[PDB]
Structure 1
Amino acid sequence: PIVQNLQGQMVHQAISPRTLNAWVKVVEEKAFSPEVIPMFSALSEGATPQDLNTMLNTVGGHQAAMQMLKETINEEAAEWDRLHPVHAGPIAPGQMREPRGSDIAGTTSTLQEQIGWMTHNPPIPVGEIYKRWIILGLNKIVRMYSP
């Protein structure tokens, strides 16, 4: 995640193993139950896309759901690209590039790039955009997996 250091700057720090394991354990115990979404939200505080793929990729089991989510993440990403067209002409030397759906999904962007966008002024909340897609896709799952 990207956290604020004592000095008063935003720097990246790694997520903790008993945080990781707590994510694992939630999924083990409460599967598709709604409490998973606030839980997720708390444990995703200050998290990167990269950390969010890590959390999704580290799941075991419920592979039908994991595939449905993936496909929702790509749909929501396809929709990001649709709604926000690429911008006019070449990229400025003085500036950094606008993200695509795949940069938001973490796929085409690097960590330093993910830190550029979030730490820069104005900052862009690429975590929160992926977060809604995850929560939206979580609703899809919850609604389906209701019996």
Structure 2
Amino acid sequence: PIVQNLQGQMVHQAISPRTLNAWVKVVEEKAFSPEVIPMFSALSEGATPQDLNTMLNTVGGHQAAMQMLKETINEEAAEWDRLHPVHAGPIAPGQMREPRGSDIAGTTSTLQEQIGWMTHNPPIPVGEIYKRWIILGLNKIVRMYSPTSILDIRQGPKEPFRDYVDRFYKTLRAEQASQEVKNWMTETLLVQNANPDCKTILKALGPGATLEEMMTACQGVGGPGHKARVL
């Protein structure tokens, strides 16, 4: 996309086909995985709403669900319209048309225009905002894929603390409320959801006990394998 050259002049450039295929590729195996969210952003570095839109557009398969995201984007754009394009709606002539919500999606902007409002006048990160919307949509997506609820998380005596923790964290990643809530719930559930046999050892850990200490001790008792069994 637009990148500052040695001279520093930003020049539009086509996305690396390799990257393109890779984006779809990571999705191929981990289409709904949460780790994708950061990844998309990473792949979205320096992305332009147009080419960027293309990246999502290029994606297929489960994308039917993504269509929902398309709507989500539309929704963010809708609110956005009220938030910024509506800041003035009609504006005085002689200046680049402020990015309207439609323009943000790039549905109503020329590549040159996108580049123009983006770097000509004070830096306009249509991509960041648009992407910001996307990440939220993705936030909803991982939730869509969410197979279980934190409450549904429970370790069996035959089950490993590793899977419990892993899945717990796995769900935790998809968990809504921040550590403010998450930590509180996590602290209680770490012990409560845990299986009885390991729970004995976890109980032994008692209050405090960092997850590390817990993992270390659990490891000592073979808790991440099945339960308090040495291994």
Structure 1-normalised TM-score? 0.92
- CA positional deviation for 1:90: 6.2
Q: 1:24 to 1:50 in 2, by over 3 A?
A: same
Contact kept? 2:19, 2:43, Cα under 8 Å? yes
Question: Quick one: distance in 2 between partners of 1:85 and 1:133?
Answer: 16
Q: Residue deviations 1:20-69, cap 9 Å, x none?
A: 11111011011110111111111111110111111111112114421210
* Percent of matched pairs sharing the same residue: 100
Q: 1:74 to 1:18 in 2, by over 3 A?
A: same
3-state SS in 1 of match to 2:85: coil
Question: Quick one: distance in 2 between partners of 1:11 and 1:135?
Answer: 26
- CA positional deviation for 1:85: 4.6
Count the aligned residue pairs: 147
- CA positional deviation for 1:88: 5.5
- CA positional deviation for 1:87: 6.1
- CA positional deviation for 1:93: 4.9
Q: 1:98 to 1:28 in 2, by over 3 A?
A: same
Q: 1:91 to 1:58 in 2, by over 3 A?
A: same
Q: 1:26 to 1:93 in 2, by over 3 A?
A: same
Question: Quick one: distance in 2 between partners of 1:61 and 1:19?
Answer: 18
Which shows bigger deviation, 72-81 or 112-121? 112-121
Question: Quick one: distance in 1 between partners of 2:120 and 2:70?
Answer: 29
Contact kept? 2:76, 2:133, Cα under 8 Å? yes
Task: Mark the structure with the bigger radius of gyration.
Answer: 2
- CA positional deviation for 1:133: 0.6
Structure 2-normalised TM-score? 0.60
Q: 1:122 to 1:65 in 2, by over 3 A?
A: same
Q: Residue deviations 1:123-142, cap 9 Å, x none?
A: 11100000111000001110
Q: Residue deviations 1:56-91, cap 9 Å, x none?
A: 111121144212101100000010112235465965
Question: Quick one: distance in 2 between partners of 1:112 and 1:91?
Answer: 21
Higher-RCO chain (CA-CA 8 Å, sequence separation at least 6): 1
What does 1:54-93 correspond to in 2, within 5 Å? 54-86=54-86, 91-93=91-93
Which shows bigger deviation, 112-121 or 59-68? 59-68
Runs of 5+ consecutive residues of structure 1 not aligned to the other structure: none
